[PDB]
Amino acid sequence: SELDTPAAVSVVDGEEMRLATPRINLSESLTGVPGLQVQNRQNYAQDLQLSIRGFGSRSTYGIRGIRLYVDGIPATMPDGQGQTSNIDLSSVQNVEVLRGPFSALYGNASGGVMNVTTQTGQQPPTIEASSYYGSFGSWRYGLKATGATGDGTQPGDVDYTVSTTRFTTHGYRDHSGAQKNLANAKLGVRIDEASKLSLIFNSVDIKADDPGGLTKAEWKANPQQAPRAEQYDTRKTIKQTQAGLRYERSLSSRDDMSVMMYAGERETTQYQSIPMAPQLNPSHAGGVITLQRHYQGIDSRWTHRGELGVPVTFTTGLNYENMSENRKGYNNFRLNSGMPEYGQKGELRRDERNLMWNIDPYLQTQWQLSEKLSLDAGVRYSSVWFDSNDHYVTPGNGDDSGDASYHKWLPAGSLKYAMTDAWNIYLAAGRGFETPTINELSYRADGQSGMNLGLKPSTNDTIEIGSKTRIGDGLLSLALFQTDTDDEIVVDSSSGGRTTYKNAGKTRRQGAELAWDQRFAGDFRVNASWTWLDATYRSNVCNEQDCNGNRMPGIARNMGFASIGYVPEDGWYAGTEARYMGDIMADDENTAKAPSYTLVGLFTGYKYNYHNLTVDLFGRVDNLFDKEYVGSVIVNESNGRYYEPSPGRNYGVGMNIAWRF
Ligand SMILES: O=C(O)c1cc(C(=O)O)c2c(n1)C(=O)C(=O)c1cc(C(=O)O)[nH]c1-2
Ligand SMILES: [Ca+2]
């Protein structure tokens, strides 16, 4: 339970996630999680940037500093690079956001862990056709067949959740149209009374134009413009298909075992806005990336519920996650006469086989020291080996083959005292560890060929106190944390969508996370939350001035959410949500700043139940007051193209037609 979790945890229920929502972006529904900053870039190539307590704000694409599991399959790779685009919002049961590295039961992460579980098929079988049309020619439809052959408690009882969605959009920005085909199957079969097998299949094909960032003047003059995106035809194709086998068994009344194996393949092509000039350097990797990532893994854990002086539940396991990378880079241009025609795959400029695999023994323990006092104490020993074998050796571009090994002990602990049956205080300490991604190692600020292997991994020590109190039909959670990070990986510079990274010697985050979910008499929901986050450099990361003490860019000091929704089981329902985002620094120097903004969204729908049929029609207006703001920044953009403008007042209408057999 959230209240019983001795750490900052938020659980966003899938149905609330789908309540009058487009079901396109996680930002639609995770906005109410304190300490979780979800930057919508209006860009399905780089996609949503998720940060937990400031960790991940450096991510120029996908997510970093957050370990994301989608139905047990890591969306975060052994190099720490993650993607949220494969999450099927239409089929999510719930999203668990764990803030802080306070559990050894998840891989290393500086910020936290996000677990997305797909709905388990239940009775009655249901086929749900969902559709949604929103501003900018946004159109997401989908079919979800979710059912089961029994209660799931008998051998051979099968549950299934098959869900396919097609999303298309012209995009708010110029050159930001995107198409995402998503398929997501969660099958389960009870082998016998003791065991349960679960198949996960996930597939996502994306073709998204990349609008890029705008300078302040560009954003002010025309927020929709994407001039570099037009010139370079910056765009991204993704094709990721993963499968997962989760075998759970009960070996005894006190013992359980769980083996989660997975294997997926992600094919990426990304045309970037790097001009020809830098690519004329033989050491340059070009302006187009083609990536073929084959990831597999097996996490085998044993949970024993015994007593050593006091009751103690320990989950000890071994996690293996391997990823191979066939990574190629081409010129993003071909020369017509003497002029580069961009948006084209040119001459090969990079060709390497990278291999990043981590092996982590881990042991989590939960001692009931007293009736009210409990102690989590876990340690994960993460050993990560990276090996780049460079196949691109030309004059001025030598053998860039290298390797690295990071071996980190990650202890976490938590003392939780039950003030009352409804009020728990907790004090959690934890060590987080973040290796640089392969892409973060790929590029040197000095422009020479070879990986930036001087990029050290970051290690963060997080202390946190917290208090969760049930205030009726709801939870009030307060968390106060300090995270001191050594060698924090930060964006050094970004140009044309390509980012070099460096290590900030010392950073400090001090934050408070208040959350309040409450259901009132009469189908009323109130979800409030406030995040305060002082994320500062404790060392100078700037090459030209003292930025020591400056706010870390990409991180809002304050975020706020307040949604009130009248959502009865059927009939007319409605809701409104105010989302405050504090201003965000776009550079280490704290000279470029995305202004703070308040976004008021409204929605109203009608659910009609006619025996086996449910028709949920709804209309929503996001950014009700038409606030001009920037939904995401590109930190340390070398040309000051920090700003990813957000739409303005926009609308959507959705229909969810469910038939229960
Ligand atoms: O979705 C992906 O798998 C993926 C991979 C990569 C990569 O590893 O090169 C990039 C991106 N996306 C991306 O969106 C992006 O803007 C980007 C820039 C670069 C680079 O090498 O400069 N890689 C990538
Ligand atoms: Ca080389």
Domain boundaries, the chain: 8-655
Report DSSP state, residue 538.
Answer: S
| Tokens found for residue 368 | 């009931």
| Tokens found for residue 313 | 């539940």
> What percentage of the chain's residues is helix, strand, coil (to nearest 5)?
5, 60, 35
d(CA 99, ligand 2 centre) in Å: 39
Residues in the chain, overall count: 661
User: Long-range contacts: 440-447, Cβ < 8 Å, 24+?
Assistant: 440/64, 440/489, 440/499, 440/501, 441/386, 441/388, 441/404, 441/501, 442/285, 443/285, 443/498, 443/499, 443/500, 443/501, 444/500, 445/492, 445/493, 445/500, 445/502, 447/278, 447/281, 447/283, 447/284
501, 452 contact by CB (below 8 A) = yes
| Tokens found for residue 114 | 């996000």
Position in ligand 1 atom list of the atom nearest CA 236: 14
Does ligand 1 lie within 6 Å of residue 266's CB atom? yes
Cα 32 from Cα 526, distance rounded (Å) = 11
Does ligand 1 lie within 6 Å of residue 597's CB atom? no
CB atoms within 10 A of CB 448: 15
Cα 153 from Cα 472, distance rounded (Å) = 32
Does ligand 1 lie within 6 Å of residue 238's CB atom? yes
Kindly report the protein residue whose alpha carbon is nearest to atom 15 of ligand 1.
61
Ligand nearest to the CA of 348: 2
Cα 301 from Cα 255, distance rounded (Å) = 11
d(CA 75, ligand 1 centre) in Å: 15
The label of the residue with tokens 């009700």 reads 624
Does ligand 1 lie within 6 Å of residue 442's CB atom? yes
Does ligand 1 lie within 6 Å of residue 43's CB atom? no
From 268, 272, 638, mutation site for ligand 1 pocket: most ligand atoms within 8 A of C-beta: 268
CB atoms within 10 A of CB 447: 11
Kindly report the protein residue whose alpha carbon is nearest to atom 12 of ligand 1.
61
3-class DSSP state of 492: strand
Experimental method: cryo-EM
Q: Give helix then strand counts, H and E, for the chain.
A: 6, 35
Does ligand 1 lie within 6 Å of residue 45's CB atom? yes
Does ligand 1 lie within 6 Å of residue 62's CB atom? yes
158, 148 contact by CB (below 8 A) = yes
What is the rounded (10 degree) CA torsion for 15, 603, 52, 628?
Answer: 160
What is the rounded (10 degree) CA torsion for 548, 551, 553, 555?
Answer: 150
Position in ligand 1 atom list of the atom nearest CA 45: 14
What type of residue is 647?
P
Does ligand 1 lie within 6 Å of residue 44's CB atom? no
* Nearest Cα to Cα of residue 165 among 144, 146, 142, 184: 142
Cα 569 from Cα 551, distance rounded (Å) = 45
- Please state the separation of Cα 447 from the chain's center in Å: 30
From 272, 289, 442, 634, mutation site for ligand 1 pocket: most ligand atoms within 8 A of C-beta: 289
Helices (H), 313-382: none
Does ligand 1 lie within 6 Å of residue 439's CB atom? yes
From 61, 353, 440, 638, mutation site for ligand 1 pocket: most ligand atoms within 8 A of C-beta: 61
Cα 318 from Cα 528, distance rounded (Å) = 38
| Tokens found for residue 625 | 């007051």
Cα 451 from Cα 592, distance rounded (Å) = 29
From 64, 270, 271, 274, mutation site for ligand 1 pocket: most ligand atoms within 8 A of C-beta: 270
Q: Are strands 138-148 and 126-134 parallel, antiparallel or unpaired?
A: antiparallel
CB atoms within 10 A of CB 427: 14
CB atoms within 10 A of CB 549: 12
Ligand nearest to the CA of 61: 1
d(CA 444, ligand 2 centre) in Å: 13
* Nearest Cα to Cα of residue 18 among 513, 526, 575: 575
Does ligand 1 lie within 6 Å of residue 83's CB atom? yes
Helices (H), 366-445: 438-442
Kindly report the protein residue whose alpha carbon is nearest to atom 9 of ligand 1.
289
CA atoms in the 13 A half-sphere facing the CB of 582 = 18
The residue numbers preceding gaps of C to N over 2.5 A in the chain are none
Does ligand 1 lie within 6 Å of residue 541's CB atom? no
Kindly report the protein residue whose alpha carbon is nearest to atom 19 of ligand 1.
498
Position in ligand 1 atom list of the atom nearest CA 293: 3
Ligand nearest to the CA of 236: 1
397, 444 contact by CB (below 8 A) = no
Position in ligand 1 atom list of the atom nearest CA 240: 3
* Nearest Cα to Cα of residue 146 among 117, 119, 121, 183: 121
From 294, 439, 636, mutation site for ligand 1 pocket: most ligand atoms within 8 A of C-beta: 439
Does ligand 1 lie within 6 Å of residue 497's CB atom? yes
Does ligand 1 lie within 6 Å of residue 99's CB atom? no
Kindly report the protein residue whose alpha carbon is nearest to atom 2 of ligand 1.
268
Helices (H), 463-591: none
Kindly report the protein residue whose alpha carbon is nearest to atom 5 of ligand 1.
268
d(CA 451, ligand 2 centre) in Å: 9
Position in ligand 1 atom list of the atom nearest CA 62: 1
312, 366 contact by CB (below 8 A) = yes
Position in ligand 1 atom list of the atom nearest CA 47: 14
Report DSSP state, residue 91.
Answer: G
3-class DSSP state of 526: strand
Ligand nearest to the CA of 399: 2
CATH for 8-655?
2.40.170.20
Query: With 0-12 CB in 10 A as exposed, 13-18 as middle and 19+ as buried, what is 590?
Result: middle
